[PDB]
Amino acid sequence: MRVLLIHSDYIEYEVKDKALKNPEPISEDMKRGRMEEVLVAFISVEKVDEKNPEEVSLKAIEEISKVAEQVKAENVFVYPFAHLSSELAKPSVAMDILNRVYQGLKERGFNVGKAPFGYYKAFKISCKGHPLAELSRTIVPEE
Amino acid sequence: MRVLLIHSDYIEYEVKDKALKNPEPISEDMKRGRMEEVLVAFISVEKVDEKNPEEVSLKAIEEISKVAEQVKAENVFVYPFAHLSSELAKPSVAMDILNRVYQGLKERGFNVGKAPFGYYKAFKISCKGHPLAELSRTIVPEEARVE
Numbered sequence: 513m514r515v516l517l518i519h520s521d522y523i524e525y526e527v528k529d530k531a532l533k534n535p536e537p538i539s540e541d542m543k544r545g546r547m548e549e550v551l552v553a554f555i556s557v558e559k560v561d562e563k564n565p566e567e568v569s570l571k572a573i574e575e576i577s578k579v580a581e582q583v584k585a586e587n588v589f590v591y592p593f594a595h596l597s598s599e600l601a602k603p604s605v606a607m608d609i610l611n612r613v614y615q616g617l618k619e620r621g622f623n624v625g626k627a628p629f630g631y632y633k634a635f636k637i638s639c640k641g642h643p644l645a646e647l648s649r650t651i652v653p654e655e
Numbered sequence: 656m657r658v659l660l661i662h663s664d665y666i667e668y669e670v671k672d673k674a675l676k677n678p679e680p681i682s683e684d685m686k687r688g689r690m691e692e693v694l695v696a697f698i699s700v701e702k703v704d705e706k707n708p709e710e711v712s713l714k715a716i717e718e719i720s721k722v723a724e725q726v727k728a729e730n731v732f733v734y735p736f737a738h739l740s741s742e743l744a745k746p747s748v749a750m751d752i753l754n755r756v757y758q759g760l761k762e763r764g765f766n767v768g769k770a771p772f773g774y775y776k777a778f779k780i781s782c783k784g785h786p787l788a789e790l791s792r793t794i795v796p797e798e799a800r801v802e
């Protein structure tokens with residue numbers, strides 16, 4: 513798994529259309545979204561992650577939570593982003609792991625939002641530009 | 656080298672402070688920068704790239720130029736983005752490679768812009784969301800990974 517963390521003033525998205533046959537079902541309201549003073553987590557689930565979804569998810573939750581603590585953010589936004597890596601996990605497993613992370617962060621007590629899985633989306637983001645505003649993590653399960 | 660390409664409506668940056676003891680020398684007017692309808696190339700120079708800076712720069716110029724052609728981006732913005740990777744190349748070497756990449760894209764005929772090297776910068780971007788609006792490219796010396 514590859515994670516790109518951007519501490520932002522805001523994150524806003526707009527769904528264009530589906531990028532695969534079976535995307536996450538969405539209601540009209542889910543086609544757009546926005547969050548402010550938020551740690552945006554762009555995540556690409558890699559095929560290596562298929563080896564142990566729970567393991568990679570738990571570690572991702574931990575790493576993202578720690579960064580959120582470091583940048584002093586209470587809002588986090590999970591953004592499916594297939595283009596951080598070239599070795600992607602199958603859609604079904606990718607969506608599952610992304611939902612695990614999303615739920616795990618909520619379990620830590622954060623205010624979490626997320627964009628729908630399986631769509632092409634336009635987005636706007638404003639990075640704060642502080643020393644820890646842009647960080648990344650490479651997480652691979654081994655168990 | 657890891658590259659994240661974002662075809663955007665615009666890119667805007669604001670230098671917040673220096674991240675290195677001796678960042679790239681720039682002037683006041685360069686503390687803020689902007690470019691419209693551009694292919695933004697966020698680049699992290701990796702440790703492995705130290706083995707052959709020229710080889711990596713050349714392949715980076717080619718990969719970036721190919722995407723620009725694909726999405727019809729006339730403007731390209733070289734944006735140093737260290738944390739795109741976890742295994743970074745020496746700062747001085749990174750600077751050198753980014754300069755070579757900039758020079759190469761300019762020679763290709765594109766309108767090239769760039770963000771100053773060695774600073775912490777806030778930035779605003781608007782990804783167009785098209786099928787090729789977000790792409791990833793990994794470029795490394797052949798000697799460090801038969802590719």
Ligand SMILES: Nc1ncnc2c1ncn2[C@@H]1O[C@H](CO)[C@@H](NC(=O)[C@@H](N)CO)[C@H]1O
Pocket residue numbers: 531532555556557558592593594595600601602603606628629630631632633634784785789
């Ligand atoms: N391994 C993976 N990791 C994360 N996301 C993945 C994935 N495989 C598929 N997706 C989702 O399907 C859309 C098209 O690939 C992906 N869409 C996107 O990455 C949009 N930002 C494009 O504009 C994403 O929602």
Ligand SMILES: Nc1ncnc2c1ncn2[C@@H]1O[C@H](CO)[C@@H](NC(=O)[C@@H](N)CO)[C@H]1O
Pocket residue numbers: 641642646674675698699700701735736737738743744745746749771772773774775776777
């Ligand atoms: N290996 C590397 N690849 C690309 N850029 C690198 C680098 N090593 C150092 N830099 C530059 O120094 C700033 C602090 O690391 C970096 N600054 C940044 O990446 C800003 N986006 C932070 O806001 C960058 O200008």
